Amino acid sequence: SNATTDEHGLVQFSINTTNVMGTSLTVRVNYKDRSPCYGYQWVSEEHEE
Amino acid sequence: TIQSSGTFSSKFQVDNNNRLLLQQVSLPELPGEYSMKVTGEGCVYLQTSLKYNILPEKEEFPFALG
Amino acid sequence: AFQPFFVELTMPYSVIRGEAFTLKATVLNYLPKCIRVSVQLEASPAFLAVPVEKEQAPHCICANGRQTVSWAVTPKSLGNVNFTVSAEALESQELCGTEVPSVPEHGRKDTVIKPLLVEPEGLEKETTFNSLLCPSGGEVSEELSLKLPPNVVEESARASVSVLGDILGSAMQNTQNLLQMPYGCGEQNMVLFAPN
Amino acid sequence: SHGCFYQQVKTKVFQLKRKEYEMKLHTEAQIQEEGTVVELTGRQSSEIT
Amino acid sequence: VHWERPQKPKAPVGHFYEPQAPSAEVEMTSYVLLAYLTAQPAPTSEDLT
Amino acid sequence: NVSVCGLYTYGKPVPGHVTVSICRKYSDASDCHGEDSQAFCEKFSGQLN
Numbered sequence: 001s002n003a004t005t006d007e008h009g010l011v012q013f014s015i016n017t018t019n020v021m022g023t024s025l026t027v028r029v030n031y032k033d034r035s036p037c038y039g040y041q042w043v044s045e046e047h048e049e
Numbered sequence: 050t051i052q053s054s055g056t057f058s059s060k061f062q063v064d065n066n067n068r069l070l071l072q073q074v075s076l077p078e079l080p081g082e083y084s085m086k087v088t089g090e091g092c093v094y095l096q097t098s099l100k101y102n103i104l105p106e107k108e109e110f111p112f113a114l115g
Numbered sequence: 116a117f118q119p120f121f122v123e124l125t126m127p128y129s130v131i132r133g134e135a136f137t138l139k140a141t142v143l144n145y146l147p148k149c150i151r152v153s154v155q156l157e158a159s160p161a162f163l164a165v166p167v168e169k170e171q172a173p174h175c176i177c178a179n180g181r182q183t184v185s186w187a188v189t190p191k192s193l194g195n196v197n198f199t200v201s202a203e204a205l206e207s208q209e210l211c212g213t214e215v216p217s218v219p220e221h222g223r224k225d226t227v228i229k230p231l232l233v234e235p236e237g238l239e240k241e242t243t244f245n246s247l248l249c250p251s252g253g254e255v256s257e258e259l260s261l262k263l264p265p266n267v268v269e270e271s272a273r274a275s276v277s278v279l280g281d282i283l284g285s286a287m288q289n290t291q292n293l294l295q296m297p298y299g300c301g302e303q304n305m306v307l308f309a310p311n
Numbered sequence: 312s313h314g315c316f317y318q319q320v321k322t323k324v325f326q327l328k329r330k331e332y333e334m335k336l337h338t339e340a341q342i343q344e345e346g347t348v349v350e351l352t353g354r355q356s357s358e359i360t
Numbered sequence: 361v362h363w364e365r366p367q368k369p370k371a372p373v374g375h376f377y378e379p380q381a382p383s384a385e386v387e388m389t390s391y392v393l394l395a396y397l398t399a400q401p402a403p404t405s406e407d408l409t
Numbered sequence: 410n411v412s413v414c415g416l417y418t419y420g421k422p423v424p425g426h427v428t429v430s431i432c433r434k435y436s437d438a439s440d441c442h443g444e445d446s447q448a449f450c451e452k453f454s455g456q457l458n
């Protein structure tokens with residue numbers, strides 16, 4: 001599910017739980033990769049996930 | 050053979066020796082009514098290209114608020 | 116080669132019939148004497164040129180001395196067009212320097228004739244057509260009607276046809292280039308096997 | 312005589328990239344009529360992250 | 361003339377090296393070709409163009 | 410040492426202006442889509458006598 005950052009950048013996301021043993025959660029504003037030219041071995045940039 | 054109404058004729062021959070040879074020729078008439086007539090055996094790819102110049106309009110007088 | 120006193124021009128290879136442009140004509144003097152020059156250009160009716168500093172008369176140019184003038188010109192004709200530039204020395208004008216003999220050879224005036232190219236005005240554009248006529252032991256025909264004269268300019272319409280047989284344009288390299296030795300796993304084995 | 316000094320610099324000469332590490336700012340003020348100079352080591356750890 | 365994938369993949373995609381998407385443009389175009397070239401008596405003219 | 414000399418018609422000298430851009434190439438920048446591969450450059454302006 002998507003959401004957005006408010007005046008304080010807070011997001012209160014709720015998830016009902018009726019599922020398996022362990023749940024993994026992740027949140028991102030960009031995708032799971034350093035989108036602009038990450039594979040060179042001479043790069044300097046990142047985006048926390 | 051390329052025949053054109055304004056008495057403009059042209060001929061070309063294609064054989065295995067000039068298999069990949071490209072035979073280019075100009076077309077000088079603005080009005081085009083070119084008729085292609087091919088005979089014999091073998092396929093032939095005919096590519097035609099035409100070119101000109103435009104944009105002498107698009108200068109009107111609408112409101113546009115100055 | 117060389118010339119003790121010459122006049123060389125500068126302009127690009129091609130221009131447009133509509134817009135205008137400047138023609139830069141320079142004159143170089145290598146003789147020790149300093150002489151005033153009368154530089155001008157004979158123009159044809161195929162265009163229209165106007166000077167920019169014609170009222171002021173040149174002063175003089177000594178050894179290794181060069182001067183330059185310009186002309187705002189606009190072309191009218193199409194294709195290659197001749198431009199003539201005539202430059203010469205003058206006598207009895209000892210106003211710039213001390214003396215001015217001004218006595219060159221019989222060809223004391225450099226009359227250079229240089230051509231320039233001009234394309235038809237307006238935004239250029241194209242149109243294409245293609246066909247595959249395959250007479251398999253008989254006769255075949257086709258008719259191509261070329262007609263696109265909306266808001267166009269005369270003589271800009273050019274057309275051309277090309278007859279060929281193109282399965283050989285790229286037939287040469289890759290056929291020669293591939294054929295390799297099979298090896299590796301099943302996947303790689305097929306990769307190197309199937310293309311052959 | 313009144314207030315404090317300001318200055319806006321440009322980070323182009325720094326080349327904030329892969330192989331150019333941290334930022335040390337050594338400011339040195341020389342108080343007049345004494346020729347007394349004093350230095351301050353600051354913001355060394357500016358996180359070019 | 362030719363055909364590509366949906367002009368650019370919609371969902372978050374890319375980064376390089378054709379990850380889980382080899383671009384398959386030459387193969388699909390050739391497939392279209394082979395299709396056009398097939399008929400029961402012999403192919404027509406338009407398909408050959 | 411650096412020098413610039415211009416040959417002309419019959420190799421005679423030519424008067425004018427010159428802008429020499431002596432440079433070191435391939436700097437710390439990543440060199441892809443936003444980083445200039447061009448490393449340090451020194452531009453000298455001379456009046457060709």
Ligand SMILES: *[C@@H]1O[C@H](CO)[C@@H](O[C@@H]2O[C@H](CO)[C@@H](O)[C@H](O)[C@H]2NC(C)=O)[C@H](O)[C@H]1NC(C)=O
Nearest residue numbers: 159194195196197198199227228229230231232
């Ligand atoms: C204009 O330019 C043309 C070249 O585009 C000149 O044509 C040459 O004229 C000489 C004779 O004066 C011929 O011997 C040459 O064969 C022509 N050109 C070529 C390359 O064959 C022409 O002299 C110039 N002047 C005029 C008045 O047209």
Ligand SMILES: *[C@@H]1O[C@H](CO)[C@@H](O)[C@H](O)[C@H]1NC(C)=O
Nearest residue numbers: 001002003004029370371372
């Ligand atoms: C995420 O979902 C919301 C609906 O809750 C939608 O408005 C939004 O467009 C979605 N995200 C994107 C990138 O479209």
Ligand SMILES: *[C@@H]1O[C@H](CO)[C@@H](O)[C@H](O)[C@H]1NC(C)=O
Nearest residue numbers: 013014015016017018019020
């Ligand atoms: C949470 O979602 C589950 C989904 O199956 C649903 O069964 C449950 O009633 C929901 N609880 C709420 C809305 O409190």
Ligand SMILES: *[C@@H]1O[C@H](CO)[C@@H](O)[C@H](O)[C@H]1NC(C)=O
Nearest residue numbers: 410411412413414431453455
């Ligand atoms: C470089 O120029 C200087 C004078 O400008 C000269 O003395 C020297 O020999 C030249 N060559 C070098 C430094 O290799």
